[model samples]
Target: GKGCLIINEGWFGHGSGSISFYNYEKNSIEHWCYKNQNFGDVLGVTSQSATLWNGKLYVCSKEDNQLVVMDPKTLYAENSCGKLANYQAYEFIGLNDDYGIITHGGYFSRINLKTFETITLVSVGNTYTGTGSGIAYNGKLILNVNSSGWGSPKVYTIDIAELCSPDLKPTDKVAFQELDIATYGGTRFVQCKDGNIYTVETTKDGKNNLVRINADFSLKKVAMRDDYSPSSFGAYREASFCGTPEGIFYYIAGGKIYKATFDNPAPEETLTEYTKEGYGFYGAGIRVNPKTNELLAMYLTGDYQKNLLVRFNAATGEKISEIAYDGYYFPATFIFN
Candidate 1:
C-alpha cells in the first residue's frame, strides 16, 4: 500500500496512458494496474503528468485535455473532467482539499475538486508559449510563464486567497519575475524542503538554468555546468526536475545526472557519468523516493527490454536497484504517497 506510481504516457493517438505501482514494502512493480483493474482499458489519452494530493491521484492527459482522478491505493479511475474543449491539459496541482488549479492553453483554471468543474481565472492567450506546469506554495500559485518565444523566461504568481476567492475579478493583480534567459516547454515545478519552488528550463542555446522562486515572488537562477538539458528528447513533455524530502534536488541533461542544493550557483557534481547505451530517458527524467531518499531514473532502450527504471543513492550517487519491463510503456512521471 505504501509506494509510488510510475505514470506511463502511452503512445499518443494509438493507445491510452497507464500506471504501474512501485511497491516500497516489497520492492516490486505491478505494471498496468489501472488497465488490469479497469477491464483492460487505459484511463486517459497521452497521460502527460500526475500529482498526489488530498488523498487522490490526478492524472492529466495532454491530447485529450482531460483530468482523471483515481484512488491512489487501488489505481482505479474514480472521477474525471471531460475534455476541456481545445485546451491541452498540461499539469495540475492541488491548492487545498476543496480546490485545485490546472494549466492549459496559456491559462490557469481554478477547479472545484468535489464538482470537477473548472472556471477560467487567468488568460494571456500565450498557448504553448504561455503556461506549463505550476505549484501551489506558501499561499501563492507559482507557474512557469513561457514568453511565447519573444522575451525572457519568467514565472507568474498570484496570491491563493485572491485566486480562490468566490468573487474573482478581471483586474486581479498577478506578479511575474523575468529570468535572464529563455526556456522551452513549461517545465515541471518542484517544491523542495528548503521552502522554495524550483524548475529547470531547457534553452536552445545550451544555457539550461535552474530557476527558483521563493515566497515573496523573487527569483534566483544558476547556469548548469554542462548543457544537461532534458527537453525535446523524451517520450513526455515536461522537463526532468525532482527533489527529495531532505531538501536536495536533481535533474538530468545530455543523458547524465547532476545534483545540487539551494545555495549553490549551479550543480555541485555530475552523479552519473553515462547511461546504458541506446537508452533515452523520458518523463520527469529523474525522481527521488521521498521515503528512502533514493534517486530513480526512467528510460527506454532500443532493444527488447524497452522500459527501464533505475534507482541510486541520492547522497552517494551510486546505483542500487533497477526494474526492467519487456514491452513498451512511455513513463511520464512518478507520483508518491
Candidate 2:
C-alpha cells in the first residue's frame, strides 16, 4: 500500500513545527505537529525522495539531528531519534529490501528500516564537506553532492553492491562535464521516461540548469533557465515532473512556472508568473496529480510565517484554489492512497 506524503514545516517559531498531508482523493489538507518534549525547534523535513514506500513516512529533522519516522495514517512519529553527525537528512532512497539510504550535510548513511540503526558510508571530503542533496538507486547508488565549505563541487556515483560488499573503497567516480564550478547547491535528481538521469542545478545567480547523465556517465545540458532565481540556501526546495496528456513537461521555479514539450529540440511551451499580493514561495514542493491532471504546490508565506497549499490546472496556468496555514517552511508534498 502507498502511504501518505508528508511535508515538513522548517524552522517555525521557537519550537513549534508542523507537517501537512495531501488527501489526493478528496483534494483537501491535513497537518501534524512536532511538539518537542524539551528543546523543540523544527529544522527541516524531507520525504525520503518524493515517493512513499512501505507503511511509514520518513523525514529527517535537521535541527534535532534525528530521523523522524511517522505512521502514514496518523502522521505522527512512531520513533524519532538522532543519528550520525550534527548533519541534516535532506534526501533519502527507499529500497524495497530491508535497508535504505539517507544523505545529509556531510555524510551518507545506510539505515535498517525495521531496526532504525545507521551506518555512515562516506565522510566529507577535504575540498567538499558533502552537502548530500539527492540520492537515486539505478542498479548503483547515485548521490548529488552539493558544495559544502568552499571548493570545487562534483557529483559522485558509488557502486552500491560493491560498497556494501565485504569491504568498501572509493572505486567509482562519475564525470560531470561542462557545468563544473565551485558554487553548486541543491542538486535534485529525477529519472525521465527515456531512462536518462536529470540533475536540476540550483545556483546563487537566480538561475537553474538541467543536466542529463547517460548510462555511460556522460553528461549533457538539456535545459537552462535564467529568468528565475534558485531558492535561497537551506530553503525546502523541489521541482516535479508534470506533463500534460499531450506529453509536455512543466515545472516551477522562483515565483513563476514554466512548461516545455518533449521533442528533438524541446520547444518552450510557456512561462507564467504565479505570486500573491503579499506572499512569495519559499522553495516548496510541486506535484502533479496524474489522475486529475492537476498541479499542486505547497508554499510558505507571511511575515509571522504561514503555510499555503495551492492548486493549478496542469494544462493551463490557471489558479484553482489557495489556502493558508500558520507556518513558514514545508519540506515536501505527497499524495496518499
Candidate 3:
C-alpha cells in the first residue's frame, strides 16, 4: 500500500551533493544530481516537522538558514521560500491561512507558506540562556529549548495569536523535573494522538530519556534507557512516534529500534525490546505513511559514505530495506499525499 524513495547524500571526497530516491513498491533506487550550487554544504533536510496544511511540503534547511519548499514526489527544485539570519531552520507548525511559524535557537519566525516570506514574530532573547530544538503548535505554540548550555533546559509556551500579531509576547515557561542539570538536554519532540507532546532527551552519558508536557505546560518524565546515544554536538536531530492502534510509542536509537507504551510511564519509561540488525540511525528524521502505516527514516552514514534512507514497519519496528547515497548529512523527512 506504500512505497519509499532513497536519496543519496553525496559524501564522497569530490563534494558533489545529490539526493537519491528509492521506490519501495518497485524495489529500486535512483540518484538525482541536484547540488546546492549556491550553498556548499547540504547539512540537513526535513518535511515532517510541521503539519501538512495544504498539498505542499514545508521543510527546514539547517545549513543555509532557509526554509525550502519542494514537491515531495519529485524532491527537486525549490517551490517558494524565505530566509532566516544566523539561525538553523529546524521545525515548523502550520497555523492558519497559509501562515506558519518556525523555531531555531533564540528566535521563531512567522512565515507565509504561499508567498515563501518570513518575519521575526517572537524572540526569547539571550537572557533565556537556551537553544530552541523542537517546536509544536496546537492552538498555542510550544517550544523546547535544550538547556545544555544553561544547565536548565526548559519548554516555553507562547500564545499563537500573540506570535502572529506583533502586539503580544510569551510570558510562561516550564522546566522538566527529571532532567539532570549536568547533562539532560537536547529534547527532540512530537505531539501524540492523546493531545500530549512527547520529547526525547539524551543524557550526558548517552542514554535516551523520554518526557511529556501537557498543554498547560506541566512536565512528566516518561522513559529512560541506554539503548542509543543521540548524535553528538547537538546539530539538529529528530525523534518521531511509531505505534500500533493501541497507542504504543516506538523509536530508533543505538543502532537499534525500540518501542514504549503507556503501561510504563516518562523519564523512567522502559522499552519492551529492541532490534539491532538495522543500520545505525544518526541525526535523521522519521516519518510514517498515513495510508499503510509504513515508516521511513533518513540519515547520513559516515565521513566517507553518503546518506541512507531506511524503510521499516512502524507498528513492529521491522526492517523492510535500505538504500545508501554519497552525501553526509540529512536531518528531515516529510510525507506527501
Best by lDDT: 1
Question: What lDDT score is found at residue 90 in candidate 2?
Answer: 56
In the range 54-157, model 2's lDDT, one tens digit per residue, is: 77766665455456666655545666656544455655566446666776556566667778766665533421355444444565666555553455456666
Q: By TM-score, how accurate is candidate 3?
A: 0.70
State every prediction's TM-score relative to the real structure.
Answer: 0.85, 0.74, 0.70
Clashing pairs in 2: 15-40, 206-229
Off by over 4 Å in 2: 1-6, 10-13, 22-28, 33-51, 71-79, 122-128, 166-183, 202-207, 231-248, 261-273, 302-304, 327-337
lDDT of 1: 0.69
Residue 78, candidate 1: how far off, in angstroms? 3.2
Best by TM-score: 1
As for TM-score, the candidate ahead, 1 or 3, is: 1
Tens-place lDDT digits, model 3, residues 169-280: 3442222222232224444556667777666656555555566667666666645556644433255444444444345566655444555655553324323233234334
User: Residue 17: error of model 2 in Å?
Assistant: 3.4
lDDT of 2 at 70: 60
Query: Could you report the Cα RMSD, in angstroms, for every candidate shown?
Result: 3.3, 5.2, 5.7
Ranking by lDDT: 1, 2, 3
What are the runs in model 3 whose C-alpha is more than 4 Å off? 5-19, 33-51, 74-78, 121-138, 166-185, 201-209, 228-233, 240-246, 265-279, 297-301, 306-308, 324-336
